[PDB]
């Protein structure tokens, strides 16, 4: 009645990974907002090769 | 185009021969337009940092105007110099090749026949 300012359905169709969702572009999710993406150590067995076995959680 | 002219004396913003040309007046409309661009940059600078646009930073607006006029004066000097070099090279090449630039015999319209196309 006053001046047309949108529905939210108009704003949601200017989002996503692509403007126009085609068949190959429908599964493309949008990238993260801060542009970062969600991404152990070595374990040796010094065996009997006195005598002693050593299980080593080594970190480099 | 004219890079062979600025190849025997490189990186000269204003050559010495540019001093043989009249400088722009300080009431140049182009220079006053560049000062208007300085005033616009001052108003946009006070607008984008949420300052009172006409009131705040009068020294800052004065330096915007002064800096644009200061750079624009030398830009107008270099503009006038480059178009003077363009016309000087044009006139020297016209004078040095008369056979490539003949004087066309100007015929009056009492000799020139034009096909009349009636409009009806």
């Amino acid at each position: 009645a006053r001046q047309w300012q949108p529905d939210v359905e108009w704003a949601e169709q200017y989002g996503g990974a692509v403007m126009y969702p085609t068949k190959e572009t429908a599964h493309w999710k949008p990238p993260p907002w801060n542009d970062v993406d969600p991404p152990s150590n070595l374990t040796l067995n010094f065996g009997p090769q006195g005598v002693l076995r050593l299980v080593m959680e080594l970190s480099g | 185009m004219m890079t062979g002219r600025q190849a025997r004396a490189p990186l000269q913003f204003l050559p010495d021969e540019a001093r043989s040309l009249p400088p722009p007046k300080l009431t140049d409309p182009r220079l006053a337009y560049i000062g208007f661009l300085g005033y616009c940059s001052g108003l946009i600078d006070n607008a984008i940092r949420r300052r009172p646009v006409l009131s705040a930073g009068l020294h800052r607006q004065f330096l915007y105007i002064t800096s644009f006029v200061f750079v624009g004066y030398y830009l107008l000097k270099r503009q006038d110099y480059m178009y003077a070099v363009r016309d000087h090279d044009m006139f020297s090449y016209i004078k040095s090749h008369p056979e490539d630039f003949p004087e066309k015999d100007k015929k009056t319209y009492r000799e020139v026949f034009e096909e009349f196309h009636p409009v009806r």
């Binding site: 006053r2 907002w33 801060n34 970062v36 969600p38 | 300052r51 009172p52 009131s55 009068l58």
Partner: protein, 320 residues
Amino acid sequence: LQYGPLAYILGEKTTKKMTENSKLITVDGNICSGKSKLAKEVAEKLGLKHFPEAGIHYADSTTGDGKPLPVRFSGNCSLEKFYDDPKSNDGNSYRLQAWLYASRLLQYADALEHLLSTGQGVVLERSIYSDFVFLEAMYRQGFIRKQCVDHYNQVKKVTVCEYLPPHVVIYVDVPVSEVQSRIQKKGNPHEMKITSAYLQDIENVYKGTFLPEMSEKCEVLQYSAWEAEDAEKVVEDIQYLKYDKGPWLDQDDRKLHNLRMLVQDKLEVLNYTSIPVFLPEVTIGAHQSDRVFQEFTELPGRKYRAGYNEDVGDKWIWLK
């Protein structure tokens, strides 16, 4: 700014002020655990700057004249209306929770900025690391929807990864019976409408989800209702810790310079709180946002940048 990369060049290194007392300590507990006195007690024993709990009007207290603004400009949400109807139509639950998450994010930014600009430690009450424990406890009560939990996890995933965990997490064990005893003895007529299972789910997400994941990234100190009454035992537990876990140990001047440049830029701290993920509890239309913004501009001291308001008595404006 006042602090920048040139200050880092000219020698203002923020490990020079990092002493053994420079500790960020977050006191956590249930709704009426009575920890609000205890944290203040720590602030008068360790010499730390106490920050109170971030309510609706924290950002109002940090800026302007420091007074709380009217609710339409700050929050557009009420704590007492959540106490009255948690399952309300207009969605005051997630709207109040998201505004509290943004207020606690500004509190945590002020905490790290004080700790890195002074070298004086900060005692916080219910920081951003202990905020989802209300949200989950709301979602276990049906007070919000699953899409609200998705929106909050999005905001938390893009905001909490930029920061460090606190040094000491002081947790208070108070069971649901004594919590209800203190709520009924408190006298707030709205707060007494809190159900039992909501407090139980707060305590469950405290004990089963919050504290085990805080146990790897920092050191927690856990107290009951009566041994948290003594401040000296808490301070003796804090001072005789051996800080050995967490990413505070591999912090040189470069990482802490990046963090201090991050937290002083308040719009970069509060950037991803208002991501354009359209959820009906937080989505405001164009006419309402326009009207509230134009009413915000005519508030005293809010028309310009802070040193530039003639209505509140700013001089020398034509030379600034």
